[PDB]
Symmetry: C3
Subunit: 152 residues, 3 copies
Amino acid sequence: VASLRQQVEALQGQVQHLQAAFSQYKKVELFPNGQSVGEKIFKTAGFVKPFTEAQLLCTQAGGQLASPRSAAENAALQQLVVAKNEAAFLSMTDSKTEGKFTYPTGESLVYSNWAPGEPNDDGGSEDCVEIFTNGKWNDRACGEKRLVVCEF
Amino acid sequence: ASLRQQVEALQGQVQHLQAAFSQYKKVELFPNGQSVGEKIFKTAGFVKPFTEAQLLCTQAGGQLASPRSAAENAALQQLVVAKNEAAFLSMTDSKTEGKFTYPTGESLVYSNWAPGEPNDDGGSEDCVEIFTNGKWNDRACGEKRLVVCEF
Amino acid sequence: ASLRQQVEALQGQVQHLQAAFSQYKKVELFPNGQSVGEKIFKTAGFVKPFTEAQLLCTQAGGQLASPRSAAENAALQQLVVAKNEAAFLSMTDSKTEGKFTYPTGESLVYSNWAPGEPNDDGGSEDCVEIFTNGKWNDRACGEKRLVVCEF
Ligand SMILES: O=C(O)C(=O)C[C@@H]1O[C@H](CO)[C@@H](O)[C@@H]1O[C@H]1O[C@H]([C@@H](O)CO)[C@@H](O)[C@H](O[C@H]2O[C@H]([C@@H](O)CO)[C@@H](O)[C@H](O)[C@@H]2O)[C@@H]1O
Ligand SMILES: O=C(O)C(=O)C[C@@H]1O[C@H](CO)[C@@H](O)[C@@H]1O[C@H]1O[C@H]([C@@H](O)CO)[C@@H](O)[C@H](O[C@H]2O[C@H]([C@@H](O)CO)[C@@H](O)[C@H](O)[C@@H]2O)[C@@H]1O
Ligand SMILES: [Ca+2]
Ligand SMILES: [Ca+2]
Ligand SMILES: [Ca+2]
Ligand SMILES: [Ca+2]
Ligand SMILES: [Ca+2]
Ligand SMILES: [Ca+2]
Ligand SMILES: [Ca+2]
Ligand SMILES: [Ca+2]
Ligand SMILES: [Ca+2]
């Protein structure tokens, strides 16, 4: 029984060292292309793609396109867009039913930050969403190239 | 007697750490890495000649990409396709012409040569590149190719 | 001995996590990072003026590269050599000309000035860069240099 005492204690020290080391590496890893907010992490690829290609990249990496669900998440995403000075695609589209924007799950939006007058389906062919450097959203043609930002 | 409550607590801490680490690992590999089994490939995202590429990987504590199976080859091919640039592998036939080896000297356990390859073209192709179609071609070591290290 | 089984399971998890973490460290540092003692330097891989560079590091939870020993300086120098671009350090004589301080206000505990430096060239150099040879030079804060943060 005294043997299990020492093993628990030795493991407490190893766990503590891992926790400390990992805390440092979290900051290192997100510099300069990531942003943590709550339990979510946004990470930019640093390049532009059309929506279908961008969506595929995020899903293949085990994430999904940026899907801000609150003001705080939106502002964190905005920091990356500002840093790269390039609008980014979000995950959401009205491809299925025009006028009705949904997450890739099909769920209706729980938060939006549309620029005034948006979404406007300009030219009758804007089914994707971009976030500007000011944090506001705009519906945009899915074939256009925008900053790839994934969430994990 | 109540080590129990320390062990239950320590287990919660370790499981929270596992979850965070798992998330940070996915983040780390996007967009310049691929995991396959216990192996991780990561590109530097630029090109170098072979000796410089090999040094970069060894100094980083890895080695140049060394796919030992079709699954590892397919994972490496994803990075090459993403950067649209052929990458150096670790293997050479510098010691014995026509006999490709890993940096340890071990003979190949897997290959994916393009038709007609290896051909030692020009009489001096002792390095190996992987193309965007995943096939291999022996290449002059002085040429600049994408640097991909395995860890 | 019901605990004894759960301790052995927990040991397995921790040992696996230690090995995974050590691997992940190598991956993370390749190719833009360097670890020296308990400090980690990481380059953003682009250039900015000092004020913008300083803000990027502080917002990331770190600060501009601040080498405090020859060993730290050599670790930083590897990144500068790899990018082939001189980098800003954290230290400035913006408060009192000719007296360089850390952002804390503390005076320098280590320096590696190039011959002749610091020279306040044009009466307008209050920031510090590190060259590819590792030596330091005072430089105008409005110039664009490699962003390197320390964590
Ligand atoms: O770079 C862009 O934002 C565009 O794609 C601009 C486009 O230029 C054309 C201008 O008529 C039109 O095809 C499109 O502008 C419309 O759509 C924009 C975005 O929703 C596209 O997704 C709007 O930003 C734009 O509004 C602005 O211009 C109008 C008009 O002056 C011209 O249509 C203003 O009423 C409005 O306040 C904005 O200044 C427009 O709806
Ligand atoms: O990129 C630079 O080094 C400069 O900023 C060059 C500038 O050119 C002008 C030359 O008269 C002057 O305004 C400045 O050069 C002086 O300052 C430099 C730095 O302190 C700027 O922060 C020095 O590097 C430079 O000296 C270098 O060149 C001289 C010359 O002999 C040319 O070979 C050398 O004596 C010295 O070893 C350096 O190589 C100069 O002091
Ligand atoms: Ca539509
Ligand atoms: Ca639409
Ligand atoms: Ca629109
Ligand atoms: Ca030969
Ligand atoms: Ca050969
Ligand atoms: Ca060949
Ligand atoms: Ca001054
Ligand atoms: Ca000065
Ligand atoms: Ca100077």
